[PDB]
PDB file of all heavy atoms in Angstrom:
ATOM      1  N   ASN A   1     285.065 -52.765 120.874  1.00  0.00           N
ATOM      2  CA  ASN A   1     285.271 -51.496 121.577  1.00  0.00           C
ATOM      3  C   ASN A   1     286.426 -50.708 120.902  1.00  0.00           C
ATOM      4  O   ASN A   1     286.327 -49.489 120.694  1.00  0.00           O
ATOM      5  CB  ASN A   1     285.562 -51.722 123.058  1.00  0.00           C
ATOM      6  CG  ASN A   1     285.333 -50.507 123.928  1.00  0.00           C
ATOM      7  OD1 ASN A   1     284.822 -49.468 123.505  1.00  0.00           O
ATOM      8  ND2 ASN A   1     285.707 -50.607 125.182  1.00  0.00           N
ATOM      9  N   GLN A   2     287.510 -51.411 120.549  1.00  0.00           N
ATOM     10  CA  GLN A   2     288.651 -50.824 119.852  1.00  0.00           C
ATOM     11  C   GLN A   2     288.206 -50.325 118.457  1.00  0.00           C
ATOM     12  O   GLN A   2     288.557 -49.211 118.070  1.00  0.00           O
ATOM     13  CB  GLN A   2     289.800 -51.846 119.731  1.00  0.00           C
ATOM     14  CG  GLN A   2     290.586 -52.073 121.032  1.00  0.00           C
ATOM     15  CD  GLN A   2     291.268 -50.819 121.545  1.00  0.00           C
ATOM     16  OE1 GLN A   2     292.237 -50.325 120.959  1.00  0.00           O
ATOM     17  NE2 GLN A   2     290.769 -50.272 122.653  1.00  0.00           N
ATOM     18  N   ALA A   3     287.378 -51.128 117.746  1.00  0.00           N
ATOM     19  CA  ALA A   3     286.854 -50.832 116.415  1.00  0.00           C
ATOM     20  C   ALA A   3     286.021 -49.567 116.401  1.00  0.00           C
ATOM     21  O   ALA A   3     286.253 -48.721 115.536  1.00  0.00           O
ATOM     22  CB  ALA A   3     286.047 -52.008 115.881  1.00  0.00           C
ATOM     23  N   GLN A   4     285.097 -49.410 117.380  1.00  0.00           N
ATOM     24  CA  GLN A   4     284.241 -48.227 117.480  1.00  0.00           C
ATOM     25  C   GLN A   4     285.015 -46.915 117.823  1.00  0.00           C
ATOM     26  O   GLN A   4     284.548 -45.823 117.486  1.00  0.00           O
ATOM     27  CB  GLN A   4     283.057 -48.464 118.438  1.00  0.00           C
ATOM     28  CG  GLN A   4     283.379 -48.543 119.941  1.00  0.00           C
ATOM     29  CD  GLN A   4     282.156 -48.506 120.838  1.00  0.00           C
ATOM     30  OE1 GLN A   4     281.023 -48.324 120.400  1.00  0.00           O
ATOM     31  NE2 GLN A   4     282.362 -48.672 122.126  1.00  0.00           N
ATOM     32  N   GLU A   5     286.192 -47.026 118.459  1.00  0.00           N
ATOM     33  CA  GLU A   5     287.022 -45.869 118.802  1.00  0.00           C
ATOM     34  C   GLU A   5     287.834 -45.334 117.579  1.00  0.00           C
ATOM     35  O   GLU A   5     288.049 -44.126 117.450  1.00  0.00           O
ATOM     36  CB  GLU A   5     287.928 -46.212 120.007  1.00  0.00           C
ATOM     37  CG  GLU A   5     288.633 -45.025 120.661  1.00  0.00           C
ATOM     38  CD  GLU A   5     287.791 -43.938 121.313  1.00  0.00           C
ATOM     39  OE1 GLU A   5     286.571 -44.143 121.518  1.00  0.00           O
ATOM     40  OE2 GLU A   5     288.368 -42.869 121.627  1.00  0.00           O
ATOM     41  N   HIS A   6     288.239 -46.233 116.675  1.00  0.00           N
ATOM     42  CA  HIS A   6     289.016 -45.883 115.486  1.00  0.00           C
ATOM     43  C   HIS A   6     288.162 -45.666 114.226  1.00  0.00           C
ATOM     44  O   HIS A   6     288.453 -44.762 113.436  1.00  0.00           O
ATOM     45  CB  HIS A   6     290.073 -46.970 115.203  1.00  0.00           C
ATOM     46  CG  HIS A   6     291.231 -46.988 116.150  1.00  0.00           C
ATOM     47  ND1 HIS A   6     291.057 -47.179 117.511  1.00  0.00           N
ATOM     48  CD2 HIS A   6     292.555 -46.905 115.891  1.00  0.00           C
ATOM     49  CE1 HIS A   6     292.272 -47.173 118.034  1.00  0.00           C
ATOM     50  NE2 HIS A   6     293.207 -47.029 117.094  1.00  0.00           N
ATOM     51  N   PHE A   7     287.159 -46.532 114.001  1.00  0.00           N
ATOM     52  CA  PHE A   7     286.371 -46.457 112.780  1.00  0.00           C
ATOM     53  C   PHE A   7     284.860 -46.335 113.011  1.00  0.00           C
ATOM     54  O   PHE A   7     284.084 -46.444 112.053  1.00  0.00           O
ATOM     55  CB  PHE A   7     286.716 -47.644 111.859  1.00  0.00           C
ATOM     56  CG  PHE A   7     288.192 -47.765 111.549  1.00  0.00           C
ATOM     57  CD1 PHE A   7     288.966 -48.753 112.144  1.00  0.00           C
ATOM     58  CD2 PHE A   7     288.821 -46.853 110.713  1.00  0.00           C
ATOM     59  CE1 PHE A   7     290.344 -48.844 111.890  1.00  0.00           C
ATOM     60  CE2 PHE A   7     290.200 -46.947 110.456  1.00  0.00           C
ATOM     61  CZ  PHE A   7     290.952 -47.941 111.049  1.00  0.00           C
ATOM     62  N   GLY A   8     284.470 -46.024 114.248  1.00  0.00           N
ATOM     63  CA  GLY A   8     283.075 -45.831 114.625  1.00  0.00           C
ATOM     64  C   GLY A   8     282.469 -44.560 114.056  1.00  0.00           C
ATOM     65  O   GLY A   8     283.088 -43.915 113.204  1.00  0.00           O
ATOM     66  N   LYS A   9     281.254 -44.186 114.539  1.00  0.00           N
ATOM     67  CA  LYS A   9     280.496 -42.999 114.118  1.00  0.00           C
ATOM     68  C   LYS A   9     281.301 -41.680 114.246  1.00  0.00           C
ATOM     69  O   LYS A   9     281.719 -41.323 115.353  1.00  0.00           O
ATOM     70  CB  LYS A   9     279.175 -42.914 114.909  1.00  0.00           C
ATOM     71  CG  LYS A   9     278.082 -42.111 114.231  1.00  0.00           C
ATOM     72  CD  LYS A   9     277.157 -43.011 113.409  1.00  0.00           C
ATOM     73  CE  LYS A   9     276.159 -42.228 112.586  1.00  0.00           C
ATOM     74  NZ  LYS A   9     275.149 -41.532 113.429  1.00  0.00           N
ATOM     75  N   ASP A  10     281.514 -40.976 113.099  1.00  0.00           N
ATOM     76  CA  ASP A  10     282.239 -39.694 112.962  1.00  0.00           C
ATOM     77  C   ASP A  10     283.679 -39.736 113.546  1.00  0.00           C
ATOM     78  O   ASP A  10     284.089 -38.827 114.287  1.00  0.00           O
ATOM     79  CB  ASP A  10     281.414 -38.510 113.544  1.00  0.00           C
ATOM     80  CG  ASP A  10     280.054 -38.221 112.902  1.00  0.00           C
ATOM     81  OD1 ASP A  10     279.632 -39.000 112.008  1.00  0.00           O
ATOM     82  OD2 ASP A  10     279.409 -37.222 113.299  1.00  0.00           O
ATOM     83  N   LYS A  11     284.453 -40.781 113.183  1.00  0.00           N
ATOM     84  CA  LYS A  11     285.798 -40.961 113.715  1.00  0.00           C
ATOM     85  C   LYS A  11     286.915 -40.950 112.661  1.00  0.00           C
ATOM     86  O   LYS A  11     287.901 -40.229 112.847  1.00  0.00           O
ATOM     87  CB  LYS A  11     285.868 -42.233 114.574  1.00  0.00           C
ATOM     88  CG  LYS A  11     285.053 -42.169 115.873  1.00  0.00           C
ATOM     89  CD  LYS A  11     285.837 -41.551 117.015  1.00  0.00           C
ATOM     90  CE  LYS A  11     285.193 -41.818 118.347  1.00  0.00           C
ATOM     91  NZ  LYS A  11     285.999 -41.266 119.467  1.00  0.00           N
ATOM     92  N   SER A  12     286.782 -41.752 111.576  1.00  0.00           N
ATOM     93  CA  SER A  12     287.801 -41.848 110.522  1.00  0.00           C
ATOM     94  C   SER A  12     287.286 -41.559 109.118  1.00  0.00           C
ATOM     95  O   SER A  12     286.183 -41.983 108.765  1.00  0.00           O
ATOM     96  CB  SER A  12     288.436 -43.231 110.532  1.00  0.00           C
ATOM     97  OG  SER A  12     289.622 -43.253 109.755  1.00  0.00           O
ATOM     98  N   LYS A  13     288.112 -40.874 108.292  1.00  0.00           N
ATOM     99  CA  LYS A  13     287.771 -40.601 106.890  1.00  0.00           C
ATOM    100  C   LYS A  13     288.053 -41.878 106.086  1.00  0.00           C
ATOM    101  O   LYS A  13     287.401 -42.119 105.060  1.00  0.00           O
ATOM    102  CB  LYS A  13     288.603 -39.431 106.344  1.00  0.00           C
ATOM    103  CG  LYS A  13     287.918 -38.675 105.197  1.00  0.00           C
ATOM    104  CD  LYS A  13     287.392 -37.289 105.616  1.00  0.00           C
ATOM    105  CE  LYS A  13     285.964 -37.293 106.136  1.00  0.00           C
ATOM    106  NZ  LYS A  13     285.862 -37.742 107.552  1.00  0.00           N
ATOM    107  N   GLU A  14     289.014 -42.702 106.608  1.00  0.00           N
ATOM    108  CA  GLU A  14     289.518 -43.987 106.094  1.00  0.00           C
ATOM    109  C   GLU A  14     288.439 -45.059 105.986  1.00  0.00           C
ATOM    110  O   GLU A  14     288.088 -45.451 104.876  1.00  0.00           O
ATOM    111  CB  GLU A  14     290.671 -44.531 106.978  1.00  0.00           C
ATOM    112  CG  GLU A  14     291.895 -43.644 107.116  1.00  0.00           C
ATOM    113  CD  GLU A  14     292.974 -43.865 106.074  1.00  0.00           C
ATOM    114  OE1 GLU A  14     293.462 -45.013 105.952  1.00  0.00           O
ATOM    115  OE2 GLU A  14     293.332 -42.886 105.378  1.00  0.00           O
ATOM    116  N   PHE A  15     287.954 -45.570 107.137  1.00  0.00           N
ATOM    117  CA  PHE A  15     286.962 -46.640 107.191  1.00  0.00           C
ATOM    118  C   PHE A  15     285.842 -46.318 108.147  1.00  0.00           C
ATOM    119  O   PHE A  15     286.048 -45.633 109.154  1.00  0.00           O
ATOM    120  CB  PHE A  15     287.639 -47.970 107.551  1.00  0.00           C
ATOM    121  CG  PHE A  15     286.772 -49.200 107.710  1.00  0.00           C
ATOM    122  CD1 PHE A  15     286.358 -49.925 106.600  1.00  0.00           C
ATOM    123  CD2 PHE A  15     286.460 -49.693 108.975  1.00  0.00           C
ATOM    124  CE1 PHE A  15     285.604 -51.093 106.753  1.00  0.00           C
ATOM    125  CE2 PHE A  15     285.717 -50.862 109.127  1.00  0.00           C
ATOM    126  CZ  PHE A  15     285.275 -51.542 108.015  1.00  0.00           C
ATOM    127  N   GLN A  16     284.637 -46.785 107.798  1.00  0.00           N
ATOM    128  CA  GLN A  16     283.419 -46.606 108.579  1.00  0.00           C
ATOM    129  C   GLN A  16     282.833 -47.987 108.838  1.00  0.00           C
ATOM    130  O   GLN A  16     282.694 -48.801 107.913  1.00  0.00           O
ATOM    131  CB  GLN A  16     282.412 -45.690 107.872  1.00  0.00           C
ATOM    132  CG  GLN A  16     282.923 -44.283 107.543  1.00  0.00           C
ATOM    133  CD  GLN A  16     283.525 -44.202 106.149  1.00  0.00           C
ATOM    134  OE1 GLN A  16     282.908 -44.611 105.150  1.00  0.00           O
ATOM    135  NE2 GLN A  16     284.742 -43.664 106.048  1.00  0.00           N
ATOM    136  N   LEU A  17     282.566 -48.263 110.124  1.00  0.00           N
ATOM    137  CA  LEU A  17     282.050 -49.522 110.652  1.00  0.00           C
ATOM    138  C   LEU A  17     280.579 -49.614 110.366  1.00  0.00           C
ATOM    139  O   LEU A  17     280.046 -50.712 110.196  1.00  0.00           O
ATOM    140  CB  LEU A  17     282.268 -49.524 112.177  1.00  0.00           C
ATOM    141  CG  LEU A  17     282.802 -50.777 112.830  1.00  0.00           C
ATOM    142  CD1 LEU A  17     284.286 -50.928 112.573  1.00  0.00           C
ATOM    143  CD2 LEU A  17     282.640 -50.681 114.306  1.00  0.00           C
ATOM    144  N   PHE A  18     279.913 -48.450 110.309  1.00  0.00           N
ATOM    145  CA  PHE A  18     278.477 -48.386 110.126  1.00  0.00           C
ATOM    146  C   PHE A  18     278.048 -47.804 108.770  1.00  0.00           C
ATOM    147  O   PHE A  18     276.955 -47.252 108.658  1.00  0.00           O
ATOM    148  CB  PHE A  18     277.866 -47.636 111.320  1.00  0.00           C
ATOM    149  CG  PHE A  18     278.266 -48.216 112.660  1.00  0.00           C
ATOM    150  CD1 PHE A  18     279.035 -47.479 113.553  1.00  0.00           C
ATOM    151  CD2 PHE A  18     277.880 -49.508 113.025  1.00  0.00           C
ATOM    152  CE1 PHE A  18     279.395 -48.011 114.798  1.00  0.00           C
ATOM    153  CE2 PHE A  18     278.237 -50.040 114.269  1.00  0.00           C
ATOM    154  CZ  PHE A  18     278.990 -49.286 115.148  1.00  0.00           C
ATOM    155  N   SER A  19     278.900 -47.959 107.733  1.00  0.00           N
ATOM    156  CA  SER A  19     278.662 -47.535 106.345  1.00  0.00           C
ATOM    157  C   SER A  19     279.597 -48.277 105.414  1.00  0.00           C
ATOM    158  O   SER A  19     280.733 -48.565 105.801  1.00  0.00           O
ATOM    159  CB  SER A  19     278.872 -46.029 106.149  1.00  0.00           C
ATOM    160  OG  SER A  19     279.387 -45.314 107.262  1.00  0.00           O
ATOM    161  N   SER A  20     279.138 -48.569 104.179  1.00  0.00           N
ATOM    162  CA  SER A  20     279.983 -49.204 103.153  1.00  0.00           C
ATOM    163  C   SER A  20     279.483 -48.953 101.745  1.00  0.00           C
ATOM    164  O   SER A  20     278.281 -49.088 101.495  1.00  0.00           O
ATOM    165  CB  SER A  20     280.159 -50.709 103.382  1.00  0.00           C
ATOM    166  OG  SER A  20     281.293 -51.230 102.696  1.00  0.00           O
ATOM    167  N   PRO A  21     280.405 -48.667 100.795  1.00  0.00           N
ATOM    168  CA  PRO A  21     279.984 -48.484  99.394  1.00  0.00           C
ATOM    169  C   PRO A  21     279.339 -49.729  98.764  1.00  0.00           C
ATOM    170  O   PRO A  21     278.515 -49.595  97.851  1.00  0.00           O
ATOM    171  CB  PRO A  21     281.293 -48.128  98.678  1.00  0.00           C
ATOM    172  CG  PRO A  21     282.375 -48.676  99.557  1.00  0.00           C
ATOM    173  CD  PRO A  21     281.863 -48.475 100.944  1.00  0.00           C
ATOM    174  N   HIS A  22     279.705 -50.931  99.269  1.00  0.00           N
ATOM    175  CA  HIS A  22     279.258 -52.239  98.778  1.00  0.00           C
ATOM    176  C   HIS A  22     277.833 -52.630  99.185  1.00  0.00           C
ATOM    177  O   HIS A  22     277.355 -53.667  98.723  1.00  0.00           O
ATOM    178  CB  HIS A  22     280.261 -53.336  99.178  1.00  0.00           C
ATOM    179  CG  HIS A  22     281.624 -53.103  98.612  1.00  0.00           C
ATOM    180  ND1 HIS A  22     282.625 -52.509  99.364  1.00  0.00           N
ATOM    181  CD2 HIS A  22     282.088 -53.317  97.358  1.00  0.00           C
ATOM    182  CE1 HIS A  22     283.670 -52.408  98.557  1.00  0.00           C
ATOM    183  NE2 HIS A  22     283.396 -52.879  97.339  1.00  0.00           N
ATOM    184  N   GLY A  23     277.169 -51.804 100.006  1.00  0.00           N
ATOM    185  CA  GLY A  23     275.798 -52.049 100.452  1.00  0.00           C
ATOM    186  C   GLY A  23     275.375 -51.442 101.780  1.00  0.00           C
ATOM    187  O   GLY A  23     276.189 -50.879 102.524  1.00  0.00           O
ATOM    188  N   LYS A  24     274.065 -51.582 102.075  1.00  0.00           N
ATOM    189  CA  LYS A  24     273.371 -51.101 103.273  1.00  0.00           C
ATOM    190  C   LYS A  24     273.267 -52.215 104.334  1.00  0.00           C
ATOM    191  O   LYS A  24     272.961 -53.359 103.985  1.00  0.00           O
ATOM    192  CB  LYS A  24     271.957 -50.594 102.883  1.00  0.00           C
ATOM    193  CG  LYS A  24     271.058 -50.121 104.042  1.00  0.00           C
ATOM    194  CD  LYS A  24     269.564 -50.122 103.681  1.00  0.00           C
ATOM    195  CE  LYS A  24     268.807 -51.332 104.195  1.00  0.00           C
ATOM    196  NZ  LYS A  24     269.192 -52.591 103.495  1.00  0.00           N
ATOM    197  N   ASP A  25     273.474 -51.849 105.628  1.00  0.00           N
ATOM    198  CA  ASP A  25     273.403 -52.684 106.839  1.00  0.00           C
ATOM    199  C   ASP A  25     274.347 -53.905 106.791  1.00  0.00           C
ATOM    200  O   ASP A  25     273.999 -54.987 107.263  1.00  0.00           O
ATOM    201  CB  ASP A  25     271.950 -53.086 107.154  1.00  0.00           C
ATOM    202  CG  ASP A  25     270.996 -51.937 107.422  1.00  0.00           C
ATOM    203  OD1 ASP A  25     271.473 -50.829 107.759  1.00  0.00           O
ATOM    204  OD2 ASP A  25     269.765 -52.152 107.317  1.00  0.00           O
ATOM    205  N   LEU A  26     275.566 -53.700 106.251  1.00  0.00           N
ATOM    206  CA  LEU A  26     276.580 -54.753 106.123  1.00  0.00           C
ATOM    207  C   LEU A  26     277.308 -54.972 107.452  1.00  0.00           C
ATOM    208  O   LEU A  26     277.888 -54.032 108.015  1.00  0.00           O
ATOM    209  CB  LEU A  26     277.582 -54.434 104.987  1.00  0.00           C
ATOM    210  CG  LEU A  26     277.081 -54.384 103.537  1.00  0.00           C
ATOM    211  CD1 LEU A  26     278.162 -53.856 102.633  1.00  0.00           C
ATOM    212  CD2 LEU A  26     276.634 -55.761 103.047  1.00  0.00           C
ATOM    213  N   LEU A  27     277.238 -56.224 107.957  1.00  0.00           N
ATOM    214  CA  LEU A  27     277.777 -56.733 109.232  1.00  0.00           C
ATOM    215  C   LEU A  27     277.084 -56.139 110.461  1.00  0.00           C
ATOM    216  O   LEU A  27     276.825 -56.874 111.419  1.00  0.00           O
ATOM    217  CB  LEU A  27     279.296 -56.607 109.357  1.00  0.00           C
ATOM    218  CG  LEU A  27     280.140 -57.303 108.306  1.00  0.00           C
ATOM    219  CD1 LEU A  27     281.541 -56.772 108.338  1.00  0.00           C
ATOM    220  CD2 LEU A  27     280.107 -58.813 108.474  1.00  0.00           C
ATOM    221  N   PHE A  28     276.794 -54.815 110.420  1.00  0.00           N
ATOM    222  CA  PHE A  28     276.150 -53.997 111.441  1.00  0.00           C
ATOM    223  C   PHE A  28     275.155 -53.035 110.756  1.00  0.00           C
ATOM    224  O   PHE A  28     275.367 -52.643 109.600  1.00  0.00           O
ATOM    225  CB  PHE A  28     277.217 -53.166 112.190  1.00  0.00           C
ATOM    226  CG  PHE A  28     278.424 -53.944 112.652  1.00  0.00           C
ATOM    227  CD1 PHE A  28     279.626 -53.861 111.968  1.00  0.00           C
ATOM    228  CD2 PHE A  28     278.345 -54.794 113.750  1.00  0.00           C
ATOM    229  CE1 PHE A  28     280.739 -54.593 112.392  1.00  0.00           C
ATOM    230  CE2 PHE A  28     279.455 -55.527 114.175  1.00  0.00           C
ATOM    231  CZ  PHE A  28     280.643 -55.429 113.488  1.00  0.00           C
ATOM    232  N   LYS A  29     274.099 -52.617 111.480  1.00  0.00           N
ATOM    233  CA  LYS A  29     273.137 -51.662 110.941  1.00  0.00           C
ATOM    234  C   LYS A  29     273.820 -50.302 110.761  1.00  0.00           C
ATOM    235  O   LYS A  29     274.608 -49.888 111.613  1.00  0.00           O
ATOM    236  CB  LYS A  29     271.874 -51.559 111.831  1.00  0.00           C
ATOM    237  CG  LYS A  29     270.781 -52.514 111.402  1.00  0.00           C
ATOM    238  CD  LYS A  29     269.807 -52.877 112.525  1.00  0.00           C
ATOM    239  CE  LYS A  29     268.573 -53.616 112.023  1.00  0.00           C
ATOM    240  NZ  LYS A  29     268.903 -54.850 111.246  1.00  0.00           N
ATOM    241  N   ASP A  30     273.530 -49.622 109.640  1.00  0.00           N
ATOM    242  CA  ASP A  30     274.102 -48.313 109.328  1.00  0.00           C
ATOM    243  C   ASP A  30     273.755 -47.235 110.354  1.00  0.00           C
ATOM    244  O   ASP A  30     274.600 -46.399 110.705  1.00  0.00           O
ATOM    245  CB  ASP A  30     273.722 -47.889 107.912  1.00  0.00           C
ATOM    246  CG  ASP A  30     274.321 -48.763 106.828  1.00  0.00           C
ATOM    247  OD1 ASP A  30     275.528 -49.087 106.913  1.00  0.00           O
ATOM    248  OD2 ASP A  30     273.603 -49.102 105.891  1.00  0.00           O
ATOM    249  N   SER A  31     272.527 -47.303 110.873  1.00  0.00           N
ATOM    250  CA  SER A  31     271.976 -46.403 111.882  1.00  0.00           C
ATOM    251  C   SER A  31     272.674 -46.457 113.256  1.00  0.00           C
ATOM    252  O   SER A  31     272.449 -45.556 114.070  1.00  0.00           O
ATOM    253  CB  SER A  31     270.498 -46.700 112.061  1.00  0.00           C
ATOM    254  OG  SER A  31     270.325 -48.092 112.241  1.00  0.00           O
ATOM    255  N   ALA A  32     273.485 -47.501 113.530  1.00  0.00           N
ATOM    256  CA  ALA A  32     274.133 -47.640 114.827  1.00  0.00           C
ATOM    257  C   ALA A  32     275.089 -46.524 115.149  1.00  0.00           C
ATOM    258  O   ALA A  32     275.714 -45.961 114.247  1.00  0.00           O
ATOM    259  CB  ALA A  32     274.816 -48.993 114.948  1.00  0.00           C
ATOM    260  N   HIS A  33     275.182 -46.185 116.445  1.00  0.00           N
ATOM    261  CA  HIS A  33     276.076 -45.152 116.994  1.00  0.00           C
ATOM    262  C   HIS A  33     277.256 -45.796 117.693  1.00  0.00           C
ATOM    263  O   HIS A  33     278.223 -45.126 118.069  1.00  0.00           O
ATOM    264  CB  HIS A  33     275.303 -44.251 117.957  1.00  0.00           C
ATOM    265  CG  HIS A  33     274.473 -43.228 117.254  1.00  0.00           C
ATOM    266  ND1 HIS A  33     274.189 -42.012 117.841  1.00  0.00           N
ATOM    267  CD2 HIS A  33     273.930 -43.254 116.015  1.00  0.00           C
ATOM    268  CE1 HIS A  33     273.472 -41.347 116.954  1.00  0.00           C
ATOM    269  NE2 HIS A  33     273.305 -42.052 115.834  1.00  0.00           N
ATOM    270  N   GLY A  34     277.179 -47.106 117.830  1.00  0.00           N
ATOM    271  CA  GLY A  34     278.232 -47.882 118.457  1.00  0.00           C
ATOM    272  C   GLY A  34     277.729 -49.117 119.161  1.00  0.00           C
ATOM    273  O   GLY A  34     276.623 -49.597 118.900  1.00  0.00           O
ATOM    274  N   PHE A  35     278.537 -49.571 120.113  1.00  0.00           N
ATOM    275  CA  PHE A  35     278.339 -50.790 120.876  1.00  0.00           C
ATOM    276  C   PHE A  35     278.386 -50.634 122.391  1.00  0.00           C
ATOM    277  O   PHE A  35     279.091 -49.757 122.921  1.00  0.00           O
ATOM    278  CB  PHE A  35     279.403 -51.820 120.456  1.00  0.00           C
ATOM    279  CG  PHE A  35     279.541 -52.058 118.972  1.00  0.00           C
ATOM    280  CD1 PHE A  35     280.778 -51.927 118.344  1.00  0.00           C
ATOM    281  CD2 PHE A  35     278.453 -52.483 118.214  1.00  0.00           C
ATOM    282  CE1 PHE A  35     280.926 -52.218 116.989  1.00  0.00           C
ATOM    283  CE2 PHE A  35     278.595 -52.732 116.845  1.00  0.00           C
ATOM    284  CZ  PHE A  35     279.838 -52.613 116.245  1.00  0.00           C
ATOM    285  N   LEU A  36     277.675 -51.566 123.073  1.00  0.00           N
ATOM    286  CA  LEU A  36     277.609 -51.710 124.527  1.00  0.00           C
ATOM    287  C   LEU A  36     277.787 -53.185 124.869  1.00  0.00           C
ATOM    288  O   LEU A  36     277.330 -54.045 124.108  1.00  0.00           O
ATOM    289  CB  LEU A  36     276.262 -51.218 125.083  1.00  0.00           C
ATOM    290  CG  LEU A  36     275.942 -49.707 124.977  1.00  0.00           C
ATOM    291  CD1 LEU A  36     274.477 -49.459 125.203  1.00  0.00           C
ATOM    292  CD2 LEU A  36     276.732 -48.914 125.949  1.00  0.00           C
ATOM    293  N   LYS A  37     278.471 -53.474 126.001  1.00  0.00           N
ATOM    294  CA  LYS A  37     278.720 -54.823 126.521  1.00  0.00           C
ATOM    295  C   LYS A  37     277.434 -55.319 127.140  1.00  0.00           C
ATOM    296  O   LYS A  37     276.769 -54.572 127.859  1.00  0.00           O
ATOM    297  CB  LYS A  37     279.785 -54.779 127.624  1.00  0.00           C
ATOM    298  CG  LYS A  37     280.795 -55.901 127.553  1.00  0.00           C
ATOM    299  CD  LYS A  37     280.489 -57.079 128.461  1.00  0.00           C
ATOM    300  CE  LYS A  37     281.742 -57.873 128.804  1.00  0.00           C
ATOM    301  NZ  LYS A  37     282.470 -58.401 127.611  1.00  0.00           N
ATOM    302  N   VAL A  38     277.081 -56.574 126.888  1.00  0.00           N
ATOM    303  CA  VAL A  38     275.875 -57.134 127.491  1.00  0.00           C
ATOM    304  C   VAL A  38     276.314 -57.677 128.857  1.00  0.00           C
ATOM    305  O   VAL A  38     277.269 -58.472 128.883  1.00  0.00           O
ATOM    306  CB  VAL A  38     275.215 -58.245 126.615  1.00  0.00           C
ATOM    307  CG1 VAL A  38     273.970 -58.810 127.292  1.00  0.00           C
ATOM    308  CG2 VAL A  38     274.878 -57.729 125.214  1.00  0.00           C
TER     309      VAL A  38
END
C-alpha cells in the first residue's frame, strides 16, 4: 500500500512499480493500476 502511493501508477519520475527498463511484467504486471487487500 505504501509502495503504490510513492511509486505506483503516475506517481514518481524516480521509480515505477509497474514498469522497468530490465523487462516486461517484472515482479508485477505492467498493466496494473495498483493493489487491493484480499
